[PDB]
Amino acid sequence: MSDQEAKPSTEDLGDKKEGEYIKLKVIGQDSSEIHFKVKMTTHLKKLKESYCQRQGVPMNSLRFLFEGQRIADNHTPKELGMEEEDVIEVYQEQTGG
Secondary structure (H helix, E strand, O other), X not given: OOOOOOOOOOOOOOOOOOOOOEEEEEEEOOOOEEEEEEOOOOOHHHHHHHHHHHHOOOOOOEEEEEOOEXXXXXXXXXXXXXXXXXXXXXXXXXOOO
16 A cells, blocks of 8 residues: 555554544645544545545655654554644655656
8 A cells, every 4th residue: 555555444452432533734845734633543544645636646756754754554643653733744756656
């Protein structure tokens, strides 16, 4: 999906409920910012690719990282240790494949 495989119906931790939510904002050098609602185990790839498709840019041309770590296809807010309304850093190249 990005670096490895990633698929829906991902297994959660178990105790974490649905009565909890977290929002995240993705920002890019293009001054673009998007605030989305996610849960603990939301694949951020879906958010990022949604922005990529919306902006019409290839996912291999752009890169999403937080605290110097790339947001992998299976990376989540719980996994990366983020908070609500936090910010993810994104850069986009103009050419790729």
